[PDB]
């Protein structure tokens, strides 16, 4: 089997992407944030504290003839940005782009943090990291991909995120029309539960490529590109007037600037992030100080190839017995 679904930016900055997901019988369609940095499929629901729901579409398990309470199961998750959610668990039928999993764990939120309430466009998350990170207790549950894998034509999914435009998540096949050149595959460590890999270096604008190993994670659920302080300083030094602002929480730059591109290495291959992908707009409405899309990972504890990086590529998440990651230009 295969599936294919369009993923759409939630706003004009590509802060996140939402993908429609059918849950239950009859289907209830929710728009979920597909997150290769976590492993829980959780949703706003009829069980979510009413004051914490503000415009989201909810899953109502009592209206699904295929929903079953997973007795005794609870979940609770905290994300790198400080947000969190928790609740109980149902199993139900879940379909993405025509690909159906029966008995998928659907984690129903009883509580969500303010950041989730305040974002009316995201109805929940669909985790695509390794199932070892799933938070369900006392019996850990499998991701949608893990459940689908054996049935897929090939045990893969691909992320093709757009810049200021829709893109695609495919399951079970590689669309050879969706990228240019070849896909370069690179080794993955699953030791921390992430799609963790090592970039071979970087360049800033038309500058020389610096060969250096950068361990990090491919994370569709993180907006920005978080890299070591040395690398980030080298980038922003090429932007007149750019500075790190402790008050704002990262590098800012004059909105009048033209940003240089940023290149990262995948083996001997190179992915070029155009300068415009690195602009996250005014820090507050009407400001002429703009927020940068490349930020330091210092104190995160891990480098993160978030949407800024991934949207410059066609990315293969290969879930074969030994997983790997592939990147192509597009």
From Swiss-Prot:
Q: Which GO terms describe its biological process?
A: proteolysis
Q: If you read the UniProt record, what top EC class would you report for this enzyme, in one word? A: hydrolase
Q: Which residues form a coiled coil?
A: none
Q: Which pairs of positions does the record mark as disulfide bonds?
A: 255-290
Which keywords does the record carry?
A: Aspartyl protease, Disulfide bond, Hydrolase, Protease, Signal, Zymogen
- Molecular function GO terms recorded: aspartic-type endopeptidase activity
Identify the catalytic residues. Answer: 35, 199
Entry's EC annotation: 3.4.23.22
Q: What is the reaction catalyzed?
A: Hydrolysis of proteins with specificity similar to that of pepsin A, prefers hydrophobic residues at P1 and P1', but does not cleave 14-Ala-|-Leu-15 in the B chain of insulin or Z-Glu-Tyr. Clots milk
Q: Does the keyword Phosphoprotein apply?
A: no
**All copies of domain Peptidase A1, residue ranges:** 17-328
**Superkingdom of the organism of origin:** Eukaryota
Which family, according to the similarity comment? Belongs to the peptidase A1 family.
| Name by which UniProt lists this protein | Endothiapepsin
Q: From which organism does this entry originate?
A: Cryphonectria parasitica (Chestnut blight fungus)
Region of the whole protein represented:
90 to 419 of 419
């Amino acid at each position: 089997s295969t599936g294919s679904a369009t993923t759409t930016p939630i706003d004009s900055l590509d802060d996140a992407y939402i993908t429609p997901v059918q849950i239950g019988t009859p289907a209830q369609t929710l728009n979920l944030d597909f997150d290769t940095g976590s492993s829980d499929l959780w949703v706003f629901s009829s069980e979510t504290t009413a004051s914490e729901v503000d415009g989201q579409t909810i899953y109502t398990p009592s209206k699904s003839t295929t929903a079953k309470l997973l007795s005794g199961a609870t979940w609770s998750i905290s994300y790198g940005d400080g947000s969190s959610s928790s609740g109980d668990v149902y199993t139900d039928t879940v379909s993405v782009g025509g690909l159906t999993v029966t008995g998928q764990a659907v984690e129903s939120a009883k509580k969500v943090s303010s950041s989730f309430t305040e974002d009316s466009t995201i109805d929940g998350l669909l985790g695509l990291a390794f199932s070892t990170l799933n938070t369900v207790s006392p019996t850990q549950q499998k991701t949608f991909f893990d459940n689908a894998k054996a049935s897929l034509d090939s045990p893969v999914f691909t992320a093709d995120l757009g810049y200021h435009a829709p893109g695609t998540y495919n399951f079970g096949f590689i669309d050879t029309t969706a990228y240019t050149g070849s896909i370069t595959y690179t080794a993955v460590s699953t030791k921390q539960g992430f799609w963790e890999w090592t970039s071979t270096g970087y360049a800033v604008g038309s500058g020389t490529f610096k060969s250096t190993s950068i361990d990090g994670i491919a994370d569709t659920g993180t907006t920005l590109l978080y890299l070591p302080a040395t690398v980030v300083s080298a980038y922003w030094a090429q932007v007149s007037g750019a500075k790190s602002s402790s008050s704002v929480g990262g590098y800012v730059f004059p909105c009048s600037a033209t940003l240089p591109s940023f290149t990262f290495g995948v083996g001997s291959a190179r992915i070029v992030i155009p300068g415009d992908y690195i602009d996250f707009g005014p820090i507050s409405t009407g400001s002429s100080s703009c927020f940068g899309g490349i930020q330091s990972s210092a104190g995160i504890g891990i480098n993160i190839f978030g949407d800024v990086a991934l949207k410059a590529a066609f990315v293969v998440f290969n879930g074969a017995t030994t997983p790997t990651l592939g990147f192509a230009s597009k």
